[PDB]
Amino acid sequence: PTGLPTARAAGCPFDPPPGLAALRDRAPLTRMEFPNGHVGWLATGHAVVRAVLADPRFSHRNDRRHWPLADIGFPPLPGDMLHIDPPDHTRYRKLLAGKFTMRRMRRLTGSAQEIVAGKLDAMERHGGPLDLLEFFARPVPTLMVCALLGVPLQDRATFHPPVRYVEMTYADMQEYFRKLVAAKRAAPADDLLSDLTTSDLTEDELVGLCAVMMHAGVDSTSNMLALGTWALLERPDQLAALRERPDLADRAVEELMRYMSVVHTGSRAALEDVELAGEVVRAGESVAFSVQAANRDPARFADPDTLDIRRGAVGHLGFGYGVHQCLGMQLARVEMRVAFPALFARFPALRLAVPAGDVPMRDDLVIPYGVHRLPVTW
Ligand SMILES: COC(=O)[C@@H]1[C@H](O)[C@H](C)[C@H](O)[C@H](C)/C=C\C=C(/C)C(=O)Nc2c(C)c(OC(C)=O)c3c(c(OC)c(C)c(O)c3c2O)C(=O)/C(C)=C/[C@@](C)(O)[C@H](O)[C@@H](C)[C@H]1O
Ligand code: HEM
């Protein structure tokens, strides 16, 4: 009977739309009308959302679900494993999961802390004020995906706007990665893309997969680095605790993932009738889910609307859940674990260069949430 609330509070940009807590505490699963007229369901409770994401009877195909954020299509792009179901998804997942484990991703930790070091150096020499996104938040995960895939160092400039060129199309990236894949076959190296030439993926799938990680691996990470930096500098008591015991960095990253929930909303479709939250999801119904409302669910988190890096543990749904749970989540953890304490160790008095109310937020219906830039100075 109700639509999806998407409007934030004007001076509370880190927090979910207020209308979600009213629908959730009324009912963690409720009826929802989608932008195209589909009468479906909205899941806001943490337990209900988690059951939605883990059940094998739910589909993420774009020809099965309805998009809850706006009215709209597309073809399942080559290398898009997120909007396909098992066993098609499973083939990607087994091929890739053992390559993204936390063991193999810590083994890029030094590369991460040198990428961060290089950009922290460029920030200082340029001087403040500057845009953190252009200078740090976007470069750092861009070069991490490059270092993960074995992009040649002389080639990385083409992939992000000059720290101070026209943004490559999704077709440009493919034509480049075709060229790069062919070079990896004749000369493999110690990187993910070299290993994957000997796999079952066609040229189309693997090339498409590379172009997806260049966007999927950057956008949400960059906005986490931006929003989390913005949140940490407002809370110098949090910074002092991270400064004192720096091993709180791991807890601090998780709590920021839970607080921000940049991938704020999604939906799945019922492949079959599924009983969920005491009530039956008809087959063919879409169940939209709010990650951000589930990460502020007081059923799961005490004082959930409070940012506190001391408690930050796992259980949040910021990386998703189930079979589609973020493949790059251990890589992203290594980046933020290195980047957040490194920023403030180098710039302890880092702070916004404009009033917080002047920070340009991304549109309510965009995925992921975040900022278009973040002027900072020190
Ligand atoms: C072109 O879409 C956009 O411009 C997005 C934007 O929100 C606009 C305003 C709008 O919503 C969109 C047009 C409308 C309907 C979208 C529908 C039905 C859909 O299927 N959604 C998507 C699509 C198409 C995705 O992309 C792939 C290839 O699967 C991804 C995705 C993710 O990373 C693993 C997600 C965590 C994720 O959740 C989604 C997602 O939900 C990616 O792999 C990449 C590469 C994502 C991205 C960096 O490119 C941006 O996040 C990107 C998705 C967004 O900027
Ligand atoms: C803070 C950083 C990140 C966040 C918040 C994030 C968020 C997410 C979320 C929520 C999903 C699941 C969406 C759903 O279930 O509908 C997802 C899936 C995915 N992410 Fe990310 N992500 C991050 C970093 C990365 C990185 C760095 C990479 C690449 C190296 C990556 C690649 C992927 C892939 C491939 C999937 C699909 C996995 C599958 O379908 O099995 N992500 N991400």
Residue numbers in the entry: 8 to 79, 82 to 173, 188 to 401
Paper excerpt:
As a result, a component whose retention time, UV/Vis (ultraviolet–visible) spectrum and m/z value are well consistent with 1 was produced (yield > 98%) giving a direct evidence for the function of StvP2 to catalyze MDB formation in mature streptovaricins. To enhance our understanding of MDB formation by StvP2, we solved the X-ray crystal structure of StvP2 at 1.35 Å resolution and the StvP2 in complex with substrate 2 at 2.3 Å resolution, respectively.
To our knowledge, the StvP2 crystal structure in complex with substrate 2 elucidated in this study is the first mechanistic characterization of a cytochrome P450 enzyme catalyzing MDB formation. The high resolution and clear electron density of substrate 2 revealed its high occupancy in the crystal, which also facilitated greatly in substrate 2 molecule model building. The substrate molecule is almost perpendicular to the heme plane in the active pocket. There are multiple interactions between the substrate and the residues of the StvP2. The NH2 group of the amide in Asn69 is hydrogen bonded to the carbonyl O atom of the amide bond in the substrate. Both of the NH of indole ring in Trp74 and the carbonyl O atom in Leu388 are hydrogen bonded to a water molecule, and this water molecule is further bond to the OH group at C21 of the substrate. In addition, the NH2 group and the O atom of carbonyl in Ile390 are bond to the H atom of hydroxyl at C-23 and C-27, respectively. Specifically, the carboxyl group of Asp89 is hydrogen bonded to the N-2 atom of imidazole group in His92, and meanwhile, the N-4 atom of imidazole group in His92 is hydrogen bonded to the O atom of the water molecule, which further forms a bifurcated hydrogen bond with the hydroxyl group at the C-1 of the substrate and the imine group of the guanidyl in Arg72, respectively.
